[PDB]
Amino acid sequence: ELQKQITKIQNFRVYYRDSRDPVWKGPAKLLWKGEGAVVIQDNSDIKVVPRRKAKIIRDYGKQMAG
Amino acid sequence: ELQKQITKIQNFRVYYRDSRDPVWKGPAKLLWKGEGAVVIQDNSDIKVVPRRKAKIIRDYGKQMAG
Amino acid sequence: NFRVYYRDSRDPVWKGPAKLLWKGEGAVVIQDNSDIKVVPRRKAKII
Amino acid sequence: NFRVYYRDSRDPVWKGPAKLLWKGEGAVVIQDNSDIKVVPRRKAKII
Amino acid sequence: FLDGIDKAQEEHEKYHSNWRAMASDFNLPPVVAKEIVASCDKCQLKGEAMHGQVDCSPGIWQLDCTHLEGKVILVAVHVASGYIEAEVIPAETGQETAYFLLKLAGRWPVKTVHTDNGSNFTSTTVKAACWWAGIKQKFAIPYNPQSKGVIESMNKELKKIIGQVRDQAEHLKTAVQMAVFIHNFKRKGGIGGYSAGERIVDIIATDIQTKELQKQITKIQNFRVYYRKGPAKLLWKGEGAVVIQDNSDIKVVPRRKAKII
Amino acid sequence: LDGIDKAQEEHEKYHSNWRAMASDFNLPPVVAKEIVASCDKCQSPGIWQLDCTHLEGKVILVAVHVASGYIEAEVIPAETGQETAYFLLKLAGRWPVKTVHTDNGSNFTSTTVKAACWWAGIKQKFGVIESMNKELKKIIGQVRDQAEHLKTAVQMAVFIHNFKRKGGIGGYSAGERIVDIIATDIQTKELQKQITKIQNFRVYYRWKGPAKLLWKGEGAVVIQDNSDIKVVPRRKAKIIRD
Amino acid sequence: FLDGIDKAQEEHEKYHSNWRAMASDFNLPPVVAKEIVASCDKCQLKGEAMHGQVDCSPGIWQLDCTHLEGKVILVAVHVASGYIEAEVIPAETGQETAYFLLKLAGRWPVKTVHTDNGSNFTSTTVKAACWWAGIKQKFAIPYNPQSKGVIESMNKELKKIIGQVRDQAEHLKTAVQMAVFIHNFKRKGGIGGYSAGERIVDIIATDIQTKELQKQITKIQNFRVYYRKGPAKLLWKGEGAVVIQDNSDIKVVPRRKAKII
Amino acid sequence: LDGIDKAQEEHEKYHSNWRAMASDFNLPPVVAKEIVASCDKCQSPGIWQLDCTHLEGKVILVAVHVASGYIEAEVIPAETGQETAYFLLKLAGRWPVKTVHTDNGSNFTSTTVKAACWWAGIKQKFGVIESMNKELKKIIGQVRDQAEHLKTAVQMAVFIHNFKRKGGIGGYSAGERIVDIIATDIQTKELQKQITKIQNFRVYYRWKGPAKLLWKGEGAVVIQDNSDIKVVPRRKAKIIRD
DNA sequence: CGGGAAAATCTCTAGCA
DNA sequence: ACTGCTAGAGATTTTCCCG
DNA sequence: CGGGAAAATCTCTAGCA
DNA sequence: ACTGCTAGAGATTTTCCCG
Ligand SMILES: C[C@@H]1CCO[C@H]2Cn3cc(C(=O)NCc4ccc(F)cc4F)c(=O)c(O)c3C(=O)N12
Ligand SMILES: C[C@@H]1CCO[C@H]2Cn3cc(C(=O)NCc4ccc(F)cc4F)c(=O)c(O)c3C(=O)N12
Ligand SMILES: [Mg+2]
Ligand SMILES: [Mg+2]
Ligand SMILES: [Zn+2]
Ligand SMILES: [Zn+2]
């Protein structure tokens, strides 16, 4: 039930930037999605990112590749 | 005699750049000066620099300041 | 308060001081002689 | 040998392939249809 | 330093010396010289050295007009994926822009457009079209192309591809559509090693899927969390940390000093 | 990994497809694909349809994605091959168009359209289109009063049909349906690419006979031998290219 | 991949796909796709991403002309220190440039000038003046201001200071000389925290002193060094390493495997 | 550090200047300066001279650095205050001009020249110049045949005098001499700045009475007490600002 | 556990006009 | 109250692959 | 040996047109 | 065979200073 859905959320990957940093950070794992913020987990570190600064995708190549 | 002169050479400081590096490296100590090359000692490391890539100065502030 | 000096619009001469109204990431809203302007933070100095 | 493609002088269109004559730090001397040109390495690709 | 400061302000009225020169020549501390400079309006001539970041939300499109071979090309880019939409139009007129934007809204979920302040983009016809389609118009700071650097860089890319394939077509409209096709489906790279078409499909499908799944999770997972406060809403828990939303302020706290009810 | 036998039993019982086993039993899509392809008893995103409709003395070129009902339509100045080719080249530049069904009209059999399809890599082939045309005409008549020119009302109708009208099983619009279908096609293409990339290897384990490779994991290697899937540690097997 | 390569070259003639797209769509290895791209002349449209470094020798000056308030300003910068020399001149004429350069040669040890290819700088009068003064002319690659970016940045600095102090003068020549003074003696920073005047005096005095001391050392210290070779000349020894000059090739070798005679 | 007594003995014997002790005994310039200033029995780069010379009906404005013989000259259109002020402002922008000696001429006492000197921070004061003018005229006559216009021959003569003619003790040209003199002045100014910066401190050592600070070294502190210089470790003394 | 090769990542530029 | 970016070319670092 | 403050260093941009 | 740079504004890291 709920655990399945949470796993499907965590299956998505987020690319994001910081306020003063112009290079896009690697594919962090999605934990929560909101109207203006997303909660991720990048290298055992949980951050809250503005929705305007994050690109959320399920990279199909990787999915199909285990 | 010779040692005095060598000490006076080593009293000068050289600013230099590398072929692919655009930031000027710190004041290395001058060891030898030639028509097209200078031999320096930057952080216990001896390099040979083209004369066109090096700025040699005796920083008077520092001299007068021990 | 703050003083803002800015380059506004295709005019190389810097203008100011102006009053800072809002400071965002990348842009500031200012007030200069009862005129409200939005300037990128590249083109502004805030004191 | 090498192939050189270059942007020469105020002309946005890239030209080549040319023969590489000399490769320095920052510039290359090339030969293109019996014409010797000196191009900055920013404006050239050497294959 | 009372004498020194006066001799430094008097010199600055003449030379506008930088802080280092007056600090050296009047024995001033760096803070005092910097204060002297900062109080001179004639020396406030440089902005701070950074750049902003454009909005990258899945619904924003950046639109612009570019010129090639004497013709006008209207170009739109979906910011989040790099997917472009271009079309040759007879003139930079609000009617042409309105028709183009109505097309784009009819083809993709366009929530917001970000353009410069050209006449065609600020026309009342375009404002009426965006209102009918429910599109929010954001206008850039005037004469700041960096505000829509995405569509500017896309203009550069489109013109390069048009130069590459101009021979294969007879008219500019055909070559523009060919370049659009090439950019959308024949050039890979970016976050997912995708083409722009693949990336836009991934982005939009992900948004739909994540919205639905999050809606279901929030409907099922309903708890209140007390930490340190009020009944904060529970967003995510696990791995020794809890993510909560208190008074529309999302914060992350460790599992300790928190209880879920 | 450990759920391969469970997946085999599930397929033998319910004939589930590889998507289901991959989502449920936590298997890589290649292994589930091989499981679903190992049983003989268990054995669209690119097709568009083009038609021309006349309304108030103007010609409207309509393209319908067959698998979803999503439409792309516009008013063209004349029923000519050049305009058809321009429309088709635009459509191929916006969507992955593989093949277009047409009605053997004059503008579709033109040499310009054939050349455009050749450049775009589209295959030309000569009931849904009629119903979609009627629906488009109904929406155009509904929203004509909101637009002075017919092309603007046509685009407004396209927008309404693609994103406002909803229907079907889950109540999604045509835009969401086409996005889902294209995403599924992209996943299918990625899986096919991975299968093609890995099918050129042969694996020797424990040495036993050559075995087809399925998944080169971080902690194990999944192989197939004698129509059976076996998991072996990486250090106990060698992989070569043939 | 024989079939795949053919289907990738045939596609590339149509779309000019980047290497990633063809590698993905034809199962090609990255090297094969990169080779396919590299053999297409239509896709060779970008130079390598670096910058050169200008000559910074103590004797080189970079000269340029700039324009302010309808007048022409001839500017020279000593590259190694940032010290400038500017003067308003009636027109960009080889006579004015020749007079200016003769002045500069008469005031400072000018060994080489590096300018762009403007008409005044390539004039026969300027070539005759440089020959009389023993100045080597280096001309930039045409239409590459980066070759003399030092004097270009100095033009920017000079114009900024002129804008700062324009009110204090009535004519542009007076304000230009005032800005020259301000830049040379009233703005500190750089390698030694110096002004440009102090830095140029330090640079030239250092060159004279180092030349004399090195001459004396080479006259006194005369030895031949054998390493690994021929009788290499001894340049510097100590700290476990020896610096030698063999066949006009300066190399550094450790004290081991070397003997001084 | 250890050579302070040696430096004191050397000064008492030979009355050497602080430059000598600093170069020889390896002492910071402040300590050697205090040593040389501690004995009562042991007790130019900015001065230019301006004159106007007439040659072939044209006026030449000549500036001579007094300490070195280095010249700056140019032909001016007229003997007016504006041209003199322009010349002086240029010279001050090229060299550290502190004071200029003049001959109470009409162009030197003008208000424009006074204003220019005020802006430039130059002091105006009203035999070397005559000899230098004669030498310049001789070189101009020598090289006149190599230049069509008199201003070009004037600049050629300036170049020859500054960098080609050599003379004196060590056989240096005027350019090398002025460079050496200005470098020595820069060293003097840096030393004066450091002395001014450090003279506002007072040091208590081992606690004894206040002592004037001389050098704040990395491993020791050099102080002066009762007209005597003593070296104390940093950890054994405290430095305060007064 | 050790080098090589391949791949991935990082650094950096022109043009957008 | 809004905001530089992109893609390609070289250089450097990680990772994989067989020992 | 420990924080704070000050200083030094590093990062980054516009204009040179 | 020749070649981006500079100086100022903010942010971050080192160093010095008294405990
Ligand atoms: C008449 C409207 C209204 C107001 O402004 C003008 C002029 N303008 C100028 C550029 C431009 O200068 N691009 C070069 C560039 C420079 C820096 C950067 F980061 C990105 C860049 F693309 C445009 O693109 C553009 O659309 C306009 C335009 O439309 N207008
Ligand atoms: C008629 C001569 C002969 C041939 O070329 C032209 C045109 N030109 C153009 C610039 C210029 O574009 N500066 C802007 C800039 C851009 C980039 C950069 F790195 C540095 C920069 F200063 C000059 O400075 C300049 O002297 C000339 C010139 O003299 N001429
Ligand atoms: Mg634009
Ligand atoms: Mg220039
Ligand atoms: Zn000022
Ligand atoms: Zn190509």
Numbering used by the authors:
A (entry chain I), B (entry chain C): 212 to 277
C (entry chain J), D (entry chain D): 222 to 268
E (entry chain G), G (entry chain A): 1 to 228, 236 to 268
F (entry chain H), H (entry chain B): 2 to 44, 57 to 139, 149 to 228, 235 to 270
What's in the article?
4d was considerably more effective than DTG against IN mutants E138K/G140A/Q148K (7.3 ± 0.6 nM; FC = 5 and 117.6 ± 11.6 nM; FC = 45, P values < 0.001, respectively) and E138K/G140S/Q148K (1.7 ± 0.3 nM; FC = 1 and 49.2 ± 2.7 nM; FC = 19, P values < 0.001, respectively). Last, we analyzed the structure E138K/G140A/Q148K_DTG containing all three substitutions. As with both the single and double mutants, E138K makes a salt bridge with vDNA. In the E138K/G140A/Q148K_DTG structure, the positively charged head group is 4.1 Å from Mg2+ at position A and 4.4 Å from Mg2+ at position B. Collectively, the all-atom free energy model simulations successfully account for the effect of the G140A mutation on the change in the binding of DTG to intasomes and highlight how G140A mediates the conformation of Q148K, leading to polarization of the Mg2+ ions and weakening chelation by the bound ligand. If residue 148 is Lys, the mutation G140A leads to a repositioning of the side chain by +240° about the γ-carbon, bringing the ζ-nitrogen to ~3.6 to 4.4 Å of the two Mg2+ ions. This reconfiguration, in turn, polarizes the charge distribution around the metal ions and weakens the chelation with the bound DTG, reduces its binding, and, consequently, leads to drug resistance. When the intasome contains the E138K/G140A/Q148K mutation, experimental density is weak for conformer A, which stacks on top of the bound INSTI, when the ligand is DTG, but is pronounced when the ligand is 4d. Despite their detrimental effect on fitness, DRMs containing G140A/Q148K combinations appear in patients demonstrating their clinical relevance. Together, the changes induced in the structure of the intasome make viruses containing G140A/Q148K or E138K/G140A/Q148K mutations less susceptible to inhibition by DTG, but the mutant INs are still able to mediate integration of vDNA into host DNA, explaining why they are found in both cell culture and PLWH.
HIV-1 and other retroviruses integrate a DNA copy of their viral RNA genome into the genome of the host cell, a process that is mediated by the virally encoded enzyme integrase (IN). Each step of DNA integration, up to formation of the integration intermediate, occurs within a series of stable nucleoprotein complexes (intasomes), involving a multimer of IN and a pair of viral DNA ends. Because integration is an essential step in viral replication, intasomes are targeted by an important class of antiretroviral drugs, the IN strand transfer inhibitors (INSTIs). INSTIs work by chelating the two Mg2+ ions, blocking the active site and inhibiting the strand transfer activity of IN.
